[PDB]
Amino acid sequence: DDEEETYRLWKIRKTIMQLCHDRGYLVTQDELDQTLEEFKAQFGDKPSEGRPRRTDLTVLVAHNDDPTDQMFVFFPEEPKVGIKTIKVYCQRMQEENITRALIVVQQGMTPSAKQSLVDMAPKYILEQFLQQELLINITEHELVPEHVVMTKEEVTELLARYKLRENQLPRIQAGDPVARYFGIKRGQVVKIIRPSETAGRYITYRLVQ
Amino acid sequence: QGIEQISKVYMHLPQTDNKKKIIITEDGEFKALQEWILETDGVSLMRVLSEKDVDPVRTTSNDIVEIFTVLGIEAVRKALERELYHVISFDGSYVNYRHLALLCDTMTCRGHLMAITRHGVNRQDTGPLMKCSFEETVDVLMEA
Amino acid sequence: DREVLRVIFPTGDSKVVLPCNLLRMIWNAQKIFHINPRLPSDLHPIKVVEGVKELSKKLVIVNGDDPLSRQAQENATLLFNIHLRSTLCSRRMAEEFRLSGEAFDWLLGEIESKFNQAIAHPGEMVGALAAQSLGEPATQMTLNT
Amino acid sequence: QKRITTPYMTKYERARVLGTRALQIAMCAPVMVELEGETDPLLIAMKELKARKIPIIIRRYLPDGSYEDWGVDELIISD
Amino acid sequence: KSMESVMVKYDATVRNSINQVVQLRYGEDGLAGESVEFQNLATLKPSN
Numbered sequence: 001d002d003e004e005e006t007y008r009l010w011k012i013r014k015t016i017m018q019l020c021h022d023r024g025y026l027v028t029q030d031e032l033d034q035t036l037e038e039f040k041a042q043f044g045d046k047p048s049e050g051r052p053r054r055t056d057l058t059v060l061v062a063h064n065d066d067p068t069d070q071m072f073v074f075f076p077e078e079p080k081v082g083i084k085t086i087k088v089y090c091q092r093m094q095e096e097n098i099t100r101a102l103i104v105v106q107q108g109m110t111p112s113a114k115q116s117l118v119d120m121a122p123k124y125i126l127e128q129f130l131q132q133e134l135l136i137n138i139t140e141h142e143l144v145p146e147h148v149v150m151t152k153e154e155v156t157e158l159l160a161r162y163k164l165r166e167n168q169l170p171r172i173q174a175g176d177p178v179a180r181y182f183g184i185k186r187g188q189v190v191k192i193i194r195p196s197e198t199a200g201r202y203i204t205y206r207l208v209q
Numbered sequence: 210q211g212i213e214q215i216s217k218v219y220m221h222l223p224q225t226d227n228k229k230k231i232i233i234t235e236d237g238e239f240k241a242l243q244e245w246i247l248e249t250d251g252v253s254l255m256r257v258l259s260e261k262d263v264d265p266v267r268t269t270s271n272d273i274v275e276i277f278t279v280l281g282i283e284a285v286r287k288a289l290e291r292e293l294y295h296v297i298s299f300d301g302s303y304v305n306y307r308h309l310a311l312l313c314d315t316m317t318c319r320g321h322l323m324a325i326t327r328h329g330v331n332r333q334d335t336g337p338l339m340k341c342s343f344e345e346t347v348d349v350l351m352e353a
Numbered sequence: 354d355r356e357v358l359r360v361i362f363p364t365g366d367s368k369v370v371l372p373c374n375l376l377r378m379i380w381n382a383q384k385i386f387h388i389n390p391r392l393p394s395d396l397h398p399i400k401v402v403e404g405v406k407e408l409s410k411k412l413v414i415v416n417g418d419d420p421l422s423r424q425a426q427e428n429a430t431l432l433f434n435i436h437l438r439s440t441l442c443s444r445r446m447a448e449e450f451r452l453s454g455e456a457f458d459w460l461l462g463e464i465e466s467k468f469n470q471a472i473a474h475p476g477e478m479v480g481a482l483a484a485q486s487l488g489e490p491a492t493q494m495t496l497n498t
Numbered sequence: 499q500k501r502i503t504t505p506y507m508t509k510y511e512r513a514r515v516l517g518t519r520a521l522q523i524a525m526c527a528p529v530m531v532e533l534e535g536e537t538d539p540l541l542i543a544m545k546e547l548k549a550r551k552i553p554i555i556i557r558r559y560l561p562d563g564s565y566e567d568w569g570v571d572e573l574i575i576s577d
Numbered sequence: 578k579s580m581e582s583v584m585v586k587y588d589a590t591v592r593n594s595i596n597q598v599v600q601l602r603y604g605e606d607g608l609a610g611e612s613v614e615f616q617n618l619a620t621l622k623p624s625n
Binding site: 110162163164167168169170196198199203204205 | 588
Binding site for chain 3: 226231233239293296299300302304305306307308309311312315353
């Protein structure tokens with residue numbers, strides 16, 4: 001069918017326009033509440049033999065604090081992705097001078113491709129997702145509290161106020177759904193703000209390792 | 210039709226204020242509303258959440274490894290706390306909050322779910338003379 | 354604060370666990386001083402406001418002056434300050450309680466002194482205390498429900 | 499200065515100060531109050547605390563390696 | 578047997594045996610569960 005397919009592509013799009021807004025990028029206001037029929041009229045009624053090809057959907061955004069650092073997102077066409085197919089993208093980043101990139105994998109990837117992304121460490125950092133996971137914003141769930149990432153100037157204020165080291169904090173591994181939603185690397189500290197019934201509000205910290 | 214693993218799905222609307230839909234009215238009063246809820250026997254939540262006309266916020270599962278893989282680590286903390294509270298307050302009893310908080314905080318402190326078990330205690334940055342008090346004295350002390 | 358409570362407690366209940374009781378402390382001060390709730394009182398309202406402010410300042414859980422140590426203090430005693438401001442407001446204590454001037458300084462001096470001795474003690478083995486506090490209510494648990 | 503700890507003598511320090519001071523009296527140490535017909539070495543050590551006249555200093559160890567020394571005279575007796 | 582050596586250190590932080598911070602304040606409030614009791618808010622329930 002295509003009605004299921006024109007629905008998903010609108011939903012997955014609406015999710016990403018918030019994911020990049022959380023990371024501190026600049027997204028126009030009406031792009032956040034783009035209703036279905038508006039999406040159906042702009043990009044095309046159906047992707048089955050239609051104008052929406054899973055390309056013409058890609059997004060390029062620029063940061064708020066700096067117009068140079070930009071982020072790209074790709075929507076591969078094949079169910080599972082090969083080797084040069086990402087190098088097609090690696091070339092597309094090489095030409096446009098963009099390092100931040102995402103790929104919305106459709107159904108899976110190959111173990112060879114798993115090797116092909118962990119190599120370019122100092123340059124061309126890419127994040128691999130799944131089509132299914134982006135269908136719902138987990139950040140707006142009930143159980144999930146509010147996370148905020150702290151600059152590297154604030155982190156040195158904790159460890160000097162509570163006279164701590166950085167080994168003595170509670171830890172979080174960079175493989176759980178909210179560690180990736182925010183694009184977190186090892187050595188960063190994230191701040192959790194949850195309300196409790198004894199005090200009213202409690203702020204805890206996590207070290208991502 | 211349906212998802213492969215979920216076999217039987219029931220249907221009822223509650224009468225308690227536990228599963229009702231509490232809204233704040235225009236006069237600023239708490240009003241409870243009866244709403245249909247569904248309960249299954251079998252879990253694959255990542256797909257059930259992705260479907261249409263299903264609330265993606267308040268839907269949850271009573272298995273916590275699934276929430277760990279799907280939702281994160283803080284969600285595991287809060288779900289574990291909620292289930293402990295529900296099993297304690299089943300027969301009208303009561304236990305203070307600090308104890309639940311401390312337990313469900315020291316249980317999910319090193320990032321991943323380590324059970325309070327034999328080989329869940331076996332792994333932490335602990336000394337050699339404590340793992341000798343647990344059934345593998347000689348080999349770990351020879352390693353040391 | 355009324356709007357913040359509605360998001361901290363979404364269900365709508367009102368039973369919370371807190372430090373020193375306030376209604377009983379008002380009832381006591383109403384009888385240590387023979388308060389007659391029939392005549393006009395002599396408690397100036399801007400005295401109530403400023404006294405409650407000054408009292409709220411002397412309830413430190415996290416002692417520090419710099420930020421990140423001056424906001425964690427406001428996060429710790431967030432609920433108790435809301436309760437204290439809603440119970441000791443100027444309308445209620447001129448309409449219902451009708452405390453005098455002499456009977457208000459006593460109440461202020463007692464709130465602080467019975468709060469400062471609720472703070473935890475540095476050295477109690479909290480871990481073992483929370484492990485048998487949950488295990489013995491595991492005994493009351495039914496075997497197969 | 500920079501004393502970050504509480505000015506209240508905690509529950510455990512009061513149980514160890516009373517035990518040590520009582521054992522020193524039993525071994526003929528000089529008392530520091532005007533007792534009246536008292537003989538129990540632990541009843542005397544309790545009325546010295548009520549008078550703030552026990553000559554012992556407490557060294558509290560912070561968990562970062564530091565410490566600070568509080569004279570028992572300076573602490574607010576809990577009971 | 579799991580949680581034997583957790584305790585409150587002299588700066589009001591709840592630390593493990595290897596000094597790994599578990600809570601920045603005991604019970605997120607800092608009070609002992611011995612001198613508390615039930616009360617009512619009386620501000621959230623009434624109407625506007």
